[PDB]
Design a protein around this ligand. Structure first.
Ligand SMILES: Cc1cc2nc3c(=O)[nH]c(=O)nc-3n(C[C@H](O)[C@H](O)[C@H](O)COP(=O)(O)O)c2cc1C
Length: 381
């Protein structure tokens, strides 16, 4: 009777339910940022969510800012992802890759040749960044040249090609939470005088150039995009956030994308924040006519209410899905939720990753069986 559990038709993709695994960085890639059988098991365990969106995945080394996140820019990486999509699909799930570029939210120690992180403008974000050699203050980024934007758009296009080869059903453009594309959108961080700056249509230009490039690889109905309309995360700030996103979302709605994915302002990246705001999903439902995913702070009842009042079509759960790989079944059965342990969110191994229990141990068996079948299929002989 919960609409959270109703099957849903995402333009030909037959999702088992209306719940989404939110994208979640977990910093557990193998060498050279290559996914492992362990990551395949983690996603296979979570195959019962109607749609999985992967952890952010950098389209280049230039686009990384955190240790051991997976990439999608080499064939070695694609081959590792193949285990992930194989295992998920053998469990009859559906999975999109989230394409990432951290922009200024990085450190030269992550960058090729010790180069500075790149960004629209040379403003450092207030805060500290973890590096291979300890915590360090943020560097002033290098502002990108006009000629280098098309280069990064092309990195997205190649990443989409690689995602398709790795067997992903679709891709999600990360345009939220203070990374490169969000930095271009906002005028606390955009400070360009060329066509990628100033105008609200100039500050969104890169986002629509990325969409153009990846929609030459995937049909637009298999390309999603994620936005954080009102967050202070990673020193973000805009002069007229209501104006900025009204246009973007309205411009997005005519692009015939797979979906629009909105983060609630009550989330500040990866933690909850007490924040009153008008730019939540109720505000954007009218301004976007396609499939709308709402994310951030939901429980069973609040997520259910968004769907009943038709304020969104799909609800994404992050931290609860870390801890409850069978979250849909727990909701259907009215079962307790495993508590999430934040100390094992980032980095490490199976602990706090694949060792959260299931209601039905056969679910856990089947995920393991497909992870190991997947490795045998795609092993690097
Ligand atoms: C550990 C962790 C990792 C995350 N990684 C990503 C990410 O890679 N990309 C992204 O868009 N959001 C990421 N998020 C934000 C989540 O997708 C989600 O919006 C957030 O957890 C709030 O949703 P929730 O209340 O259901 O947990 C992450 C959040 C957490 C807690």
């Amino acid at each position: 009777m919960l609409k959270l559990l109703e099957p849903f038709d995402l333009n030909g993709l037959e999702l088992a339910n209306r719940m989404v695994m939110a994208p979640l960085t977990r910093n557990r890639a193998g060498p050279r940022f290559v996914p492992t059988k362990m990551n395949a098991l983690y996603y296979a365990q979570r195959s019962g969510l109607g749609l999985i969106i992967t952890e952010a995945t950098q389209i280049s080394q230039q686009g990384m800012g955190y240790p051991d996140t997976p990439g999608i820019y080499t064939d070695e990486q694609v081959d590792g992802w193949r285990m992930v999509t194989e295992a998920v699909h053998r469990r009859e799930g559906c999975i999109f890759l989230q394409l990432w570029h951290v922009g200024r939210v990085s450190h030269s120690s992550f960058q090729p040749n010790g180069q500075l992180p790149v960004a629209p403008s040379a403003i450092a974000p207030e805060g500290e960044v973890m590096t291979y050699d300890g915590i360090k203050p943020f560097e002033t980024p290098r502002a990108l040249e006009t000629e280098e934007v098309a280069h990064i758009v092309e990195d997205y296009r190649k990443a989409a090609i690689n995602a398709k080869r790795a067997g992903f059903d679709g891709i999600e453009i990360h345009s939220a939470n203070g990374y490169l594309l969000h930095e271009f959108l906002e005028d606390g961080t955009n400070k360009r005088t060329d066509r990628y700056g100033g105008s609200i249509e100039n500050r969104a230009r890169i986002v629509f150039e990325v969409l153009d490039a990846v929609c030459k690889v995937y049909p637009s109905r298999r390309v999603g995009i994620r936005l954080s309309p009102d967050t202070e995360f990673m020193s973000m700030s805009d002069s007229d956030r209501p104006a900025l996103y009204s246009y973007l979302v309205q411009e997005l709605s005519r692009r015939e994308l797979a979906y629009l994915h909105l983060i609630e302002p009550r989330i500040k990246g990866n933690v909850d924040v007490e924040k009153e705001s008008s730019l939540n999903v109720e505000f954007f439902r009218p301004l976007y006519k396609g499939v709308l995913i709402t994310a951030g702070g939901y429980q069973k009842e609040t997520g259910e209410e968004r769907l009943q009042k038709q304020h969104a079509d799909l609800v994404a759960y992050g931290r609860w899905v870390i801890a409850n790989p069978d979250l849909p079944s727990r909701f259907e059965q009215n079962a307790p939720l495993n508590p999430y342990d934040r100390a094992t969110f980032y980095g490490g191994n199976e602990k706090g990753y694949t060792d959260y229990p299931f209601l039905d141990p056969r679910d856990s068996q089947e995920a393991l069986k497909e992870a190991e079948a997947a490795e045998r299929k795609w092993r690097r002989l």
